[PDB]
């Protein structure tokens, strides 16, 4: 797309690695280790796709 195609998404991180041929369809807010963070985004919390 001439100004950018944003219809294709990719994943930057998970909780851990993944076994072969597996599908991680589930999407949720990801926190970093020990900080209590849920519901919305912010510090050490943003949408992984």
């Amino acid at each position, epitope marked *: *797309k*001439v*100004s950018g195609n944003y*219809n294709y998404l990719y994943r930057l991180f998970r909780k851990s690695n993944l076994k072969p041929f597996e599908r991680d369809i589930s999407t949720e807010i990801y926190q970093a280790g020990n900080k209590p963070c849920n519901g919305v985004a912010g510090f050490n919390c943003y949408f992984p796709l």
Partner: antibody
Amino acid sequence: ITLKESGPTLVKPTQTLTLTCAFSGFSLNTGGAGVGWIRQPPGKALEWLALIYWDGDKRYNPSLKSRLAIIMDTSKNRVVLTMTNMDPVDTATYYCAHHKIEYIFDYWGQGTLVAVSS
Amino acid sequence: ALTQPASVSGSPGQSITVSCTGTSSDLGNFQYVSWYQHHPGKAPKLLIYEVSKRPSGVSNRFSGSKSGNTASLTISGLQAEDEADYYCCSYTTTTIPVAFGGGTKLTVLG
């Protein structure tokens, strides 16, 4: 393939332009093709206005977002461009065309010219 | 950006060549640049897509080639109705994503 362009002849300085263009015959089962609108006045070269894909995405020229709207029929009949708050420098001719990405404008319509009544 | 000479002239029959160029920083790797022709009172038509690929319906006398930062087209065997408004259109990533020539008006001396 036929492309039909319709628009007013003379418009008021405070009126909004409603250009229409109809296309007959395309391979709609594709990706990246679409319908584009371009204009030029006499005495100055060409400049692009807008382009629409088949997924409903609208791409206008920058800093002209608010005064450009597109009616897409979802029936493969016609595409309408409605532009508000016109300027007497925009009194120009308008071409509706098909838009791939290699062919920047593959087939060109006849287009219609418009001028201000002021 | 993208620029070309405003007008060009020469002897009828042969000996004409029209070129475009632009700044390499604005130009996104210089792919998919096309050459069109505009007539007064008639709809413009496509002649050359992506430098040196020939579409259907055109004659073999039209040719195009690009060297370094400059692209160009040549035509041999000119006629009395071969005056044109040859435009180059290209992709520019930093500014407005499409750029459309600088204006040409070929004239003959017949």
